[PDB]
Design a protein around this ligand. Structure first.
Ligand SMILES: CCCCCCCCCCCCOP(=O)([O-])OCC[N+](C)(C)C
Ligand SMILES: CCCCCCCCCCCCOP(=O)([O-])OCC[N+](C)(C)C
Ligand SMILES: CCCCCCCCCCCCOP(=O)([O-])OCC[N+](C)(C)C
Ligand SMILES: CCCCCCCCCCCCOP(=O)([O-])OCC[N+](C)(C)C
Ligand SMILES: CCCCCCCCCCCCOP(=O)([O-])OCC[N+](C)(C)C
Ligand SMILES: CCCCCCCCCCCCOP(=O)([O-])OCC[N+](C)(C)C
Ligand SMILES: CCCCCCCCCCCCOP(=O)([O-])OCC[N+](C)(C)C
Ligand SMILES: CCCCCCCCCCCCOP(=O)([O-])OCC[N+](C)(C)C
Ligand SMILES: CCCCCCCCCCCCOP(=O)([O-])OCC[N+](C)(C)C
Ligand SMILES: CCCCCCCCCCCCOP(=O)([O-])OCC[N+](C)(C)C
Ligand SMILES: CCCCCCCCCCCCOP(=O)([O-])OCC[N+](C)(C)C
Ligand SMILES: CCCCCCCCCCCCOP(=O)([O-])OCC[N+](C)(C)C
Ligand SMILES: CCCCCCCCCCCCOP(=O)([O-])OCC[N+](C)(C)C
Ligand code: NA
Ligand code: NA
Ligand code: NA
Ligand code: NA
Ligand code: NA
Ligand code: NA
Ligand code: NA
Ligand code: NA
Ligand code: NA
Ligand code: NA
Lengths: 69, 69, 69, 69, 69, 69, 69, 69, 69, 69, 69, 69, 69
């Protein structure tokens, strides 16, 4: 039950984080394609946004380990 | 049952928080691409919107922990 | 059952709240990118809309805590 | 089964009400962007539509409370 | 089972009624935005349409109460 | 089992009836917006199509009552 | 088991019939809007098409009652 | 199990057949609006396609009745 | 288990078959509408494709009957 | 367990196969509509693609029978 | 359990393999239609891509068999 | 439980790997069609992306085997 | 439950990572096709984005092995 729990928590967090980053990274690739001169502005948005999007997935991962220990 | 509960809360919280942020960050990246001159305005919307979107997912994380402890 | 229940309520409230805020903030970012003069106008709608969209999710959070305590 | 029932009613009602509101608010933001002279008219539609959309979710919340108490 | 049933009936009715109302209201807002002269005509379609969409969700709320009591 | 059954039939009937009506009403709001001279004509199709779409959801509500009583 | 079965059969039949009708009535409303002189023509296609789409859902409703009785 | 099986078979057959016919009728309505001259030609394709689409659902309904009786 | 099995095989076969045919017929209708002079040619693709698409659903139907009997 | 297994393998194989073929056939019909001179070319792509798309669904059918027998 | 296991690996691998191939082949057909001069190069892409898409679906099929045997 | 596990690992790995490869191969085909001068550029992108996308599904396949042995 | 747990974590991790990488690689390909000069800029974004998006999926894989061993 602890195993199932930890797995569901880890599993959903993986999906959460991976898709979220992918959406953001795509956005900056498309924007950069549209406006090469905004490369740096766009990249900084990516670097701010990724951590924000991974925050709760990371927490859920931690909880996943707490369930396992 | 406590493990499963906590996993579900954290897992769904992860999905909610991560995707929400991505939608918002993407919108911001796109907007800034269309209108570089609006950078700051759009970044303010991001910084306001992100916390607002995280609020309930964060509360569900607190509940996930209350279930575990 | 109480743990499982508390989780289902909080988890679903997280999704509901996070996604609804994303949709509203994204529309606000988009409206503003399109018509920068309506920046304040669109901001006011975001500030009215968000509490409205969070209302039921927040009540579900309370019910979650009630199920738990 | 009461906890599970309460949660299910409350969580679904939260998804229902939050997303319904997001859709209505997003329409209002899009409409006001295109036709700013109509902001009042549209805001009235939003203030009518929102309560209408929240009606069954709230009754489900009330049912969630009856299941608990 | 009475609790689980009542909650399933009420949860689904809320999803049904709220989303359906949102869709209709959105349409009315988009329509009124394109053709402001039609605002009353469109509003009458909303007021006729909303009760029709809510009809069966309301019946299912009654059934939810009949199962609960 | 009766309770669970009645709720599944009522809840699915609600989703069915509410969404279909919404689809049909949206379409008549959009059409009326594009071709206001067709107001009456389109309203007639709405009034024909709504009962038709509600037919089977209503039989299922009846079956829902038969399971409860 | 009979109750569950009757509910599943009737609930799936309601979704089926209601959505199918909705798709056809919508197509009819859109078509009529684009070509008002084909009102009768298209209305005939609706009246042929609806019974065809409703056919199996109605059989499933018969099976629902056979299961209930 | 027989009841639940007959129900799954008939309910899936209803979803399959109603949606399938709706897709085909819609195409026929859209085609006729686009190129009204082909009314009869498209109607023939509809009359050929509807029975073909309905074939496996109807067999599944028969299997439903075999499971029941 | 036999009953449940036969119903899953048959119901899934029905959805596969009916929707596959609809997609192909829809395409043939759209094709014919755009290029009336290819009527015969597009029809022949339809008569080749339906049997091909229906091939595995039909086997699934045989397996459903093997399970029953 | 063997009946439920055989039904799952077969019913999934049916959805896999039917839908894959429908997607390929539709693409052939659309291509032939747009470029009638490529008829034979596109038809050969269809005849290579369909067996390939069905290879795994077909193996899943064999495995389904191995489970029954 | 062995049976149910083999069925899930096989049906999943069937869905994965068929749909992937359908997407790749549809791409080849659409591209060949737009730029027939690239028939050979697009066909090489497809003959490289299809096996790569099938790699893990085929391994999963091997596992399904180890589970059975 | 082992069989079931192994099957969930391998079937999800199959879906994951297959669809991902299809998305990438499709993108390669569509781009080469728009810009045949870049067929080698695009193909190098494809040969880099594919192994990356398969990394985790391949590992997950290893795990599936560990579970089974 | 350890087996089932490890499989859920590894399988969800595979879907997460595969799709995220694919979305990103697709974006890179589309951008490179639209703007061949940015080839290297876009490729760097891809080499930053991929490791990022696979981070949490990799942690879930690690967790999958913990659960197993
Ligand atoms: C458990 C299932 C996991 C996978 C669920 C689906 C994964 C894919 C999610 C991403 C889908 C949406 O993409 P996107 O980049 O926002 O497109 C934006 C397109 N524009 C450029 C026009 C804005
Ligand atoms: C349980 C697993 C759940 C997986 C959830 C995955 C959901 C991903 C949804 C992301 C897609 C939405 O993207 P977005 O930025 O709103 O743009 C959409 C509108 N435009 C393209 C025009 C901008
Ligand atoms: C476990 C289940 C998780 C569910 C996750 C579902 C994610 C849904 C995300 C929805 C994102 C899209 O929103 P939106 O901007 O209103 O549409 C865009 C419309 N425009 C084309 C006008 C821009
Ligand atoms: C279990 C949790 C489920 C969460 C599901 C969330 C889904 C939210 C999707 C809502 C999408 C709302 O976009 P829409 O009204 O089509 O925009 C159309 C705007 N234009 C008319 C300008 C194009
Ligand atoms: C259990 C979770 C349930 C969540 C379900 C969410 C469903 C939301 C679907 C409704 C999305 C919008 O649709 P609509 O406004 O009719 O069309 C869009 C209008 N245009 C055609 C002009 C773009
Ligand atoms: C239990 C959860 C059930 C949720 C079910 C929600 C279903 C909502 C989808 C129905 C709204 C769709 O609107 P529509 O008029 O077809 O526009 C679609 C956009 N076009 C007109 C361009 C096609
Ligand atoms: C549990 C069941 C939940 C209910 C599921 C709801 C499904 C709703 C799907 C209904 C979608 C409406 O399609 P349609 O109007 O034929 O397309 C119109 C396309 N054009 C307007 C661009 C031509
Ligand atoms: C349990 C779920 C039951 C409800 C499922 C609803 C499925 C709706 C399927 C789609 C219904 C209508 O789209 P369609 O006729 O394919 O044309 C769309 C493409 N065109 C715009 C070119 C015409
Ligand atoms: C009951 C549970 C299972 C229900 C499954 C129902 C699924 C029905 C979905 C049928 C949709 C098929 O649309 P179509 O004609 O290929 O057009 C698609 C054209 N575009 C891709 C360009 C939009
Ligand atoms: C039990 C589960 C059953 C699920 C059944 C779902 C079936 C839905 C399949 C729908 C596939 C539709 O794709 P398509 O028409 O090839 O794309 C058309 C795109 N263009 C027109 C732009 C080329
Ligand atoms: C449980 C089993 C359910 C299986 C249901 C699988 C349904 C898969 C349907 C997937 C069809 C996707 O088509 P596609 O190639 O992306 O075309 C998109 C056309 N354009 C790129 C031009 C826009
Ligand atoms: C059991 C679950 C089975 C799920 C099967 C999922 C089907 C695969 C996903 C659907 C196909 C996604 O096509 P894509 O090339 O990414 O976007 C479209 C490319 N354009 C930019 C041209 C629009
Ligand atoms: C077991 C269930 C597994 C389901 C996995 C299904 C995954 C489907 C992934 C398909 C997502 C494709 O999004 P994307 O590449 O951003 O297209 C964006 C194209 N535009 C920019 C034109 C919008
Ligand atoms: Na973008
Ligand atoms: Na945007
Ligand atoms: Na918007
Ligand atoms: Na509208
Ligand atoms: Na319409
Ligand atoms: Na239409
Ligand atoms: Na059509
Ligand atoms: Na077509
Ligand atoms: Na592409
Ligand atoms: Na892109």
């Amino acid at each position: 039950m602890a195993f199932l729990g930890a797995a569901i928590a880890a599993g959903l967090a993986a999906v959460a984080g991976a898709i979220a980053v992918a959406i953001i990274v795509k956005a900056t690739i498309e924007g950069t394609t549209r406006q090469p001169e905004l490369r740096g502005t766009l990249q900084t948005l990516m670097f701010i946004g990724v951590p924000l999007a991974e925050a709760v997935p990371i927490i859920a991962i931690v909880i996943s380990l707490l369930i396992l220990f």
